[PDB]
mmCIF file of C-alpha atoms in Angstrom:
data_model
loop_
_atom_site.group_PDB
_atom_site.id
_atom_site.type_symbol
_atom_site.label_atom_id
_atom_site.label_comp_id
_atom_site.label_asym_id
_atom_site.label_seq_id
_atom_site.Cartn_x
_atom_site.Cartn_y
_atom_site.Cartn_z
ATOM 1 C CA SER A 22 16.556 33.718 21.025
ATOM 2 C CA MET A 23 16.238 35.101 19.032
ATOM 3 C CA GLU A 24 17.992 32.853 15.875
ATOM 4 C CA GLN A 25 15.890 30.376 16.647
ATOM 5 C CA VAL A 26 12.442 32.687 15.998
ATOM 6 C CA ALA A 27 14.582 34.212 12.781
ATOM 7 C CA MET A 28 15.102 30.545 11.874
ATOM 8 C CA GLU A 29 11.186 29.285 12.507
ATOM 9 C CA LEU A 30 9.739 32.029 9.986
ATOM 10 C CA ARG A 31 12.301 30.594 7.217
ATOM 11 C CA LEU A 32 11.260 27.285 7.339
ATOM 12 C CA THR A 33 7.537 28.895 8.047
ATOM 13 C CA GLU A 34 8.128 30.949 4.914
ATOM 14 C CA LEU A 35 9.122 26.891 3.782
ATOM 15 C CA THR A 36 6.447 25.257 4.653
ATOM 16 C CA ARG A 37 4.669 27.685 2.776
ATOM 17 C CA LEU A 38 6.183 27.623 -1.379
ATOM 18 C CA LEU A 39 6.627 24.057 -0.069
ATOM 19 C CA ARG A 40 2.380 24.147 0.326
ATOM 20 C CA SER A 41 1.648 25.540 -2.891
ATOM 21 C CA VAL A 42 4.171 23.224 -4.356
ATOM 22 C CA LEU A 43 2.246 20.366 -3.091
ATOM 23 C CA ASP A 44 -0.951 22.233 -4.402
ATOM 24 C CA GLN A 45 0.325 22.233 -7.738
ATOM 25 C CA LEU A 46 1.945 18.914 -7.541
ATOM 26 C CA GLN A 47 -1.615 17.301 -6.697
ATOM 27 C CA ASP A 48 -3.145 19.676 -9.581
ATOM 28 C CA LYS A 49 -1.296 16.761 -11.686
ATOM 29 C CA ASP A 50 -3.070 14.006 -10.426
ATOM 30 C CA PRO A 51 -6.832 14.463 -11.273
ATOM 31 C CA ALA A 52 -7.540 10.838 -11.158
ATOM 32 C CA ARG A 53 -6.558 10.854 -7.705
ATOM 33 C CA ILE A 54 -4.413 7.563 -7.246
ATOM 34 C CA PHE A 55 -1.897 9.355 -5.613
ATOM 35 C CA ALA A 56 -4.145 10.668 -2.816
ATOM 36 C CA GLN A 57 -4.366 8.306 -0.750
ATOM 37 C CA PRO A 58 -2.440 5.856 1.373
ATOM 38 C CA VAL A 59 -2.203 2.198 -0.873
ATOM 39 C CA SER A 60 -4.878 0.019 1.052
ATOM 40 C CA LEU A 61 -3.433 -3.161 3.317
ATOM 41 C CA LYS A 62 -6.764 -4.139 3.016
ATOM 42 C CA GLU A 63 -7.579 -4.483 -0.560
ATOM 43 C CA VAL A 64 -3.601 -4.581 -0.521
ATOM 44 C CA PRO A 65 -2.609 -7.247 1.801
ATOM 45 C CA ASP A 66 1.206 -7.793 1.042
ATOM 46 C CA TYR A 67 2.034 -4.476 0.052
ATOM 47 C CA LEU A 68 4.494 -4.532 2.106
ATOM 48 C CA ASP A 69 7.140 -7.371 1.707
ATOM 49 C CA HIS A 70 7.003 -4.867 -2.435
ATOM 50 C CA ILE A 71 6.956 -1.495 -1.402
ATOM 51 C CA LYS A 72 9.078 -0.791 1.861
ATOM 52 C CA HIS A 73 8.326 2.911 2.269
ATOM 53 C CA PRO A 74 4.817 3.510 1.141
ATOM 54 C CA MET A 75 4.106 7.373 0.285
ATOM 55 C CA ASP A 76 0.646 9.333 -0.970
ATOM 56 C CA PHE A 77 0.093 12.945 -0.703
ATOM 57 C CA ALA A 78 -2.139 12.652 2.074
ATOM 58 C CA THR A 79 1.024 11.708 4.438
ATOM 59 C CA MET A 80 3.195 14.125 2.863
ATOM 60 C CA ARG A 81 0.539 16.974 3.321
ATOM 61 C CA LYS A 82 0.897 15.975 7.253
ATOM 62 C CA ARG A 83 4.551 15.657 7.419
ATOM 63 C CA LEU A 84 4.103 19.953 5.898
ATOM 64 C CA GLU A 85 1.720 20.749 8.253
ATOM 65 C CA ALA A 86 3.871 19.185 11.252
ATOM 66 C CA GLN A 87 6.918 21.678 9.441
ATOM 67 C CA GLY A 88 8.510 18.338 9.345
ATOM 68 C CA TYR A 89 10.460 18.963 5.606
ATOM 69 C CA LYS A 90 13.881 20.744 6.728
ATOM 70 C CA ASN A 91 14.598 22.288 2.773
ATOM 71 C CA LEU A 92 13.376 21.345 -0.791
ATOM 72 C CA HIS A 93 15.203 17.933 -1.101
ATOM 73 C CA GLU A 94 13.559 16.538 1.981
ATOM 74 C CA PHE A 95 10.411 16.952 -0.367
ATOM 75 C CA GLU A 96 11.588 15.594 -3.376
ATOM 76 C CA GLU A 97 12.348 11.790 -1.581
ATOM 77 C CA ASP A 98 8.831 12.191 -0.383
ATOM 78 C CA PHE A 99 8.126 12.823 -3.793
ATOM 79 C CA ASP A 100 10.104 10.386 -5.796
ATOM 80 C CA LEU A 101 8.767 7.566 -3.279
ATOM 81 C CA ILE A 102 5.305 8.230 -4.596
ATOM 82 C CA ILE A 103 6.345 7.808 -8.649
ATOM 83 C CA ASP A 104 9.150 5.198 -8.020
ATOM 84 C CA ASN A 105 6.940 3.321 -5.217
ATOM 85 C CA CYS A 106 4.218 3.012 -7.912
ATOM 86 C CA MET A 107 6.418 2.406 -10.856
ATOM 87 C CA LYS A 108 7.627 -0.989 -9.341
ATOM 88 C CA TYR A 109 3.991 -2.705 -7.442
ATOM 89 C CA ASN A 110 2.122 -1.573 -11.414
ATOM 90 C CA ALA A 111 3.556 -2.989 -14.833
ATOM 91 C CA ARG A 112 3.500 -1.018 -17.078
ATOM 92 C CA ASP A 113 0.570 -1.490 -19.397
ATOM 93 C CA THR A 114 -1.273 -0.491 -16.620
ATOM 94 C CA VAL A 115 -3.491 2.779 -15.812
ATOM 95 C CA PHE A 116 -1.405 3.173 -12.026
ATOM 96 C CA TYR A 117 2.227 2.960 -13.968
ATOM 97 C CA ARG A 118 0.663 5.675 -16.633
ATOM 98 C CA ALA A 119 -0.406 7.816 -13.701
ATOM 99 C CA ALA A 120 3.313 8.214 -12.380
ATOM 100 C CA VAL A 121 4.948 8.707 -15.446
ATOM 101 C CA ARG A 122 2.779 11.331 -16.169
ATOM 102 C CA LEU A 123 2.421 13.042 -12.781
ATOM 103 C CA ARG A 124 6.524 12.602 -12.740
ATOM 104 C CA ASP A 125 6.774 14.372 -16.186
ATOM 105 C CA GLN A 126 4.181 17.214 -15.051
ATOM 106 C CA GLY A 127 6.026 17.097 -12.148
ATOM 107 C CA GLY A 128 9.599 18.746 -13.467
ATOM 108 C CA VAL A 129 8.159 21.944 -14.240
ATOM 109 C CA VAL A 130 6.755 22.775 -11.059
ATOM 110 C CA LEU A 131 10.619 21.130 -8.703
ATOM 111 C CA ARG A 132 12.319 22.892 -11.184
ATOM 112 C CA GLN A 133 11.058 26.456 -10.317
ATOM 113 C CA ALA A 134 10.495 25.988 -6.796
ATOM 114 C CA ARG A 135 14.500 24.730 -6.063
ATOM 115 C CA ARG A 136 15.203 28.450 -8.204
ATOM 116 C CA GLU A 137 12.204 30.321 -5.898
ATOM 117 C CA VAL A 138 13.856 28.620 -2.709
ATOM 118 C CA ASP A 139 17.450 28.585 -3.630
ATOM 119 C CA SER A 140 16.605 32.922 -4.366
ATOM 120 C CA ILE A 141 14.340 33.606 -1.744
ATOM 121 C CA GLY A 142 17.565 31.658 0.402
#
């Protein structure tokens, strides 16, 4: 149908906007601490601590399969990156500190993205 196409164009445009959002969030992680999944070869107990791992490469695969229906689902994944880190790692660690700075800096980007998603519809 023509509606299904219209729908698919909106999703495609949401994916376009979310791709730009993802690039902006990932620039706030210049150390690349959150770039890839925590290695289960290197942290073999990880899944005993963290039940839903997440990282920027994993978000990117979901994004490119247009697997985010709305900004809320995208934010959920970004929040997992931060929140998982802040639980697994202690406060005095470069990892925890990196998460705090990504959260703080990402806030600005996410604030505008929400306005843009509501605005463009």
